[PDB]
Amino acid sequence: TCPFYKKIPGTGFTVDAFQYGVVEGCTAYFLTHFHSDHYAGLSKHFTFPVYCSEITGNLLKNKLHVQEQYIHPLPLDTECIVNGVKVVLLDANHCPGAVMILFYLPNGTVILHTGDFRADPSMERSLLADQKVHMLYLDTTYCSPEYTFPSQQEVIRFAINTAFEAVTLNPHALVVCGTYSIGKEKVFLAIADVLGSKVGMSQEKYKTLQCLNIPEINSLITTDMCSSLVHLLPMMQINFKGLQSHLKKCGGKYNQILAFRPTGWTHSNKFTRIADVIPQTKGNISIYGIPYSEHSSYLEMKRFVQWLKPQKIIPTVNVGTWKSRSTMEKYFREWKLEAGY
Numbered sequence: 001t002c003p004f005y006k007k008i009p010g011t012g013f014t015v016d017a018f019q020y021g022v023v024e025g026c027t028a029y030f031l032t033h034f035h036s037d038h039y040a041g042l043s044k045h046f047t048f049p050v051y052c053s054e055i056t057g058n059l060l061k062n063k064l065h066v067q068e069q070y071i072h073p074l075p076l077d078t079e080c081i082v083n084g085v086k087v088v089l090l091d092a093n094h095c096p097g098a099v100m101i102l103f104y105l106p107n108g109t110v111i112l113h114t115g116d117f118r119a120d121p122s123m124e125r126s127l128l129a130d131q132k133v134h135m136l137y138l139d140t141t142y143c144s145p146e147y148t149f150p151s152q153q154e155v156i157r158f159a160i161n162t163a164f165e166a167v168t169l170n171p172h173a174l175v176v177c178g179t180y181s182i183g184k185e186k187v188f189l190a191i192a193d194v195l196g197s198k199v200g201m202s203q204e205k206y207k208t209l210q211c212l213n214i215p216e217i218n219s220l221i222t223t224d225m226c227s228s229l230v231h232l233l234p235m236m237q238i239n240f241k242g243l244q245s246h247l248k249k250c251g252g253k254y255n256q257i258l259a260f261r262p263t264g265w266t267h268s269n270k271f272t273r274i275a276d277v278i279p280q281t282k283g284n285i286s287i288y289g290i291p292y293s294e295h296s297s298y299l300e301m302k303r304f305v306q307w308l309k310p311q312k313i314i315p316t317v318n319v320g321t322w323k324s325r326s327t328m329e330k331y332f333r334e335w336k337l338e339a340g341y
C-alpha cells in the first residue's frame, strides 16, 4: 500500500506515488522528477491530474505518452494554487526538471518535500528563506558520514583534462560515456566541448535529451555516430566485453577506447582523492569510475538541515530496515543538539 512518507497531511496530495493504483482520497499526484523509481506506474492510460515542472511534463508527453489534458506543468519560484492549496516548486539541483515542493497548509503548517536533491548553499537564498518550515520530507540517500565526494566542478575538471590529454596523444582514440537515465549530462557535454565534437547516441536517447530545454542542444548532440568521437552507450555496455564489441562496430576508425562510468559513491572515496583516481585497463580499453553525484553528501545534507531547522524530519530513502531508520534518527538528533533548535 502507499507508504505514509508519500502522503502530504491535510491535503488530498501524494508525491511520487504512481505504482499503488488509485490512492484512496488522492485529488492530485505530484511527480518531483523523471526517474523510474519515482514515475513507476505512469502511462498513456493515466486519468488523474499530474503536477510537475515543464521539463518533467515534456518527458511525460513524449516518452511515456501521458495525455496532455492530465499534465499540469508549473513554473519554478512562483506561488501557485492547486485544489485550494498554495504550492511553490524549487530547483532541486538533481537531474533536469527535478524539483522540491513547498506546501502551505490551510492550518498554517508549512511542509517542504525535497524530492531527490543535492543540497547547496544557494538554496539558502531562494523563497525558502522567507518563512519557517515545520516538516521536512528529506532525501536521505547518503545520510552517513562515510559519504564524502568532491564538487561537481572538480569532477568535470578531471574528466575534461583526462579526455583532452588522451585524444591529443592519440587522435584515433574514441571516448565513451555510460548513461541509464536523465542526469549527469555535464559529463559527456563538457568532454565533447573540449574535443570539438558532438556527442553521438541512439535515437531513443537523442529524443530524451531534446525534451530538456538545454540551450544550443542542437549544436552539441547528434544521432550520426560516424561523425562523432564522444559516444553515449547504456551503462550496462560499459565493461571490457561491451566496449571491445563496440570498437569492432566502428570499422577501424578507432584503435583505443577511454570510457567513463559516472557512479554515485564508491568506497575508493574513503581513501582516494580525485587527483589520484586511476582506470581499470585491459589491452587498448581503459574505464574510469568518476564520483559525479546528483545527491547531497552527508556534510551538504547536514548543513541544509541545520540551516532550515525543521520541527520534524521524515526520511524518504533507506527507510526499509530498522537499523537504517534508527541510524538516521540518531544523526538528526545530533544535528539538532549541535545547532540548538
Ligand code: NI
Pocket: 033, 035, 094, 116
Ligand atoms: Ni532521482
